[PDB]
Amino acid sequence: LHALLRDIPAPDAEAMARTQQHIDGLLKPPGSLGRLETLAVQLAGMPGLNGTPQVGEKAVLVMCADHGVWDEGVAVSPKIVTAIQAANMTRGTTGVCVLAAQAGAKVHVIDVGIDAEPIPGVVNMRVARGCGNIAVGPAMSRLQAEALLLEVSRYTCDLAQRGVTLFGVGELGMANTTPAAAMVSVFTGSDAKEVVGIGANLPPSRIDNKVDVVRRAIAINQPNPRDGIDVLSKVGGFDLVGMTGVMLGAARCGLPVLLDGFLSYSAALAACQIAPAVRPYLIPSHFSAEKGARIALAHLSMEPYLHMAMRLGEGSGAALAMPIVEAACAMFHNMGELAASNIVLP
Amino acid sequence: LHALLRDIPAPDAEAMARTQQHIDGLLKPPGSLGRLETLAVQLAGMPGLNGTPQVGEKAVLVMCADHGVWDEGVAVSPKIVTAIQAANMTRGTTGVCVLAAQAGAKVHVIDVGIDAEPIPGVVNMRVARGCGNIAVGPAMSRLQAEALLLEVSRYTCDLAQRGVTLFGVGELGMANTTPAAAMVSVFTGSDAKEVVGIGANLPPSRIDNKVDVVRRAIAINQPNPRDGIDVLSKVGGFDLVGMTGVMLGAARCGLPVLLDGFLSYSAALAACQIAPAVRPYLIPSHFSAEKGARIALAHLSMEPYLHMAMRLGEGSGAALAMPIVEAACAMFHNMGELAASNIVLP
Ligand SMILES: COc1ccc2nc[nH]c2c1
Ligand SMILES: COc1ccc2nc[nH]c2c1
């Protein structure tokens, strides 16, 4: 793990300088393509990309897990939905599935802690049948966290070998916006009221209780903000852990990762906390409709591309942004050059 | 023309109600897919869509024209770029071309007023070799405007027959952000300073002059804000006119049109001014980096999906949004249903 972390490559500034130069000479007013240009330069700096903005195979990793905190009345979806939906993931009927297929990406369903019998077709990395209830104690042990980090990391980088160059991260677990709020609050120093959202249609009347739960998790666990692994294990969840793992793995592998929504922001705060070197590999997707979105993003210093008012999760936002990433490559590679037209612009 | 305008169909509320119902039953928390849901319902209401969100063939229409106002020192690109770039459009090397191809859309280059010899491969609808200089008089005659409106309209709806279901609109004409600013100012009642942008990298020192030019165009022409055709003809341009025409045609045809950036916003204000019935067919794409973007959009009551800091034009933003439109259809059609999973959500 310390190994893994140490070995995260820095971006190739040399490749980046060449990219910029090339971009500047394309058939257009310099910088006219805004964020598409920036995006492309960002990709060129990623070592696993071979000095150029390029997209090979695409995968979306969905981390599924149940949470003890569900018993605190924080989630109106019935617990079993995790298991059901997870199964659906295997049939290509979910929101992520549909969106991924549209993006030509492949969805990988990973069970890291579902409170149900194993589901065939789902990758089994199950830590336990749901995590501990953060309202009265830690979600899991430090060891348990580090281990999953390792395991997910590896799996992630291993896909790299199969030709994957672009990752999308997602989750599935009833009541997960709660631990998410807790983490944000902790890493960010914001009060719970500020970061707690309605999750999957939580009735306005039930908000108050959700906030209390969050505050409690915090007070009881005393998670240390300067220690991401500490935070994750105490008030996080299996699914949160797994997302952070994907992020560490893609970074170690020198590859780009597309974030999703609020849950994903939480995991990104942790990964950056654990390894700042991770930052440059992260790519925002959309701007989640969850209440704590703006704060979480501000702390990440990220401005998403898409404003869709989405709040489904599953990695649906991630899939949705893939074409944008492809567009930047097409731009980079297929556009003609000013010089070839004898055009000169200031 | 009065005919055309009269015959613009209202959206099918019945189809819309069925869409919503169907959407609500999909494998997810109701409304969790935000704007993607809204988008889909919007499409279902379009008569040319056959009661459902669907996308057949896709086309991007690029209106190219030169402007007399170029002589007022408002644009740093050399005039000839219109002609050059237009030619490039025919080779698939431009920004729109690259983006359209990525979206599987076809680009249609239309010459409505280029100040150069005709370009083979380009559709010829040339009104004149550039429009009049708005700083000292009208861009063209009312008749000239109405005619192009008619001609572009028809061409547009005619594509509908060839299987096109989704239009994207774009332009190409050096110095065009100037007439654009003028129109915005007029329709919006904003002062020129507020709406005048840097266009294609206009040096900050040269801004002042651009604003004066705009104010002048206005004072001299006295365009009537309650008359879109009046505005267009006086301080607009051939390309502006043509964009408005695409919009009227797609609406008459009962089809959706994707807007681009600032120039496109201008044309949309005019079309809505001329025919409010046009509104429901319009679909924002991205949020242009041009200074007058926010005002123009506010007047259109539109919130774009994409924040890319783009300012290239050509219909590049339009192409970029196409996959989003496709995504809403996929969602609508390929997602599984809650009932089929025995899942019940509040
Ligand atoms: C290719 O040079 C230019 C200059 C201005 C432009 N506006 C749209 N495309 C452009 C290309
Ligand atoms: C299908 O029902 C549900 C409920 C919550 C969910 N969160 C993500 N997908 C979900 C599906």
Curated annotation (Swiss-Prot), chains A, B:
Q: Which InterPro entries does the record match to this protein? A: Nict_dMeBzImd_PRibTrfase, Nict_dMeBzImd_PRibTrfase_bact, Nict_dMeBzImd_PRibTrfase_N, Nict_dMeBzImd_PRibTrfase_sf
UniProt keyword list: Cobalamin biosynthesis, Glycosyltransferase, Nucleotide-binding, Transferase
Knockout-associated phenotype: No growth on cobinamide (CBI); double cobB-cobT deletion mutants do not grow on CBI and DMB.
Q: Where is substrate bound in this sequence?
A: 85
Instruction: Supply one GO BP term.
Output: cobalamin biosynthetic process
Q: Which domain of life is it from?
A: Bacteria
Q: Does the keyword Glycosyltransferase apply?
A: yes
Q: Which CDD domains match?
A: DMB-PRT_CobT (cd02439)
Instruction: Describe the effect of residue 172 to M.
Output: Alters specificity to use phenolic compounds as substrate
Q: Does the keyword Glycosyltransferase apply?
A: yes
Q: In which pathway does it act?
A: Nucleoside biosynthesis; alpha-ribazole biosynthesis; alpha-ribazole from 5,6-dimethylbenzimidazole: step 1/2
Select a single GO molecular function from the record's annotations and give it.
nucleotide binding
Any idea which positions bind nicotinate beta-D-ribonucleotide? Answer: 171-177, 200, 262, 288, 311-312
Site residues, Important for substrate positioning, might be proton acceptor: 171, 314
Give, as one word, the top-level EC class: transferase
Per the UniProt record, one Pfam family is DBI_PRT
What the entry lists under NCBIfam families is as follows: cobT_DBIPRT, PRK00105.1
Q: What else is known?
A: In vitro assays of this enzyme are performed at pH 10 because at physiological pH (7.0) its activity is undetectable; this makes it difficult to assess the role of mutagenesis of potential proton acceptor active site residues (Glu-171 and Glu-314).
Function per UniProt:
Catalyzes the synthesis of alpha-ribazole-5'-phosphate from nicotinate mononucleotide (NAMN) and 5,6-dimethylbenzimidazole (DMB). Able to use a variety of other nucleotide bases as substrate to create alternative lower ligands for cobamide.
Provide the assembly information.
Homodimer.
Would you identify the family this protein belongs to, as annotated? Belongs to the CobT family.
Name of the featured protein? Nicotinate-nucleotide--dimethylbenzimidazole phosphoribosyltransferase
* Organism of provenance: Salmonella typhimurium (strain LT2 / SGSC1412 / ATCC 700720)
Encoded by which gene? cobT
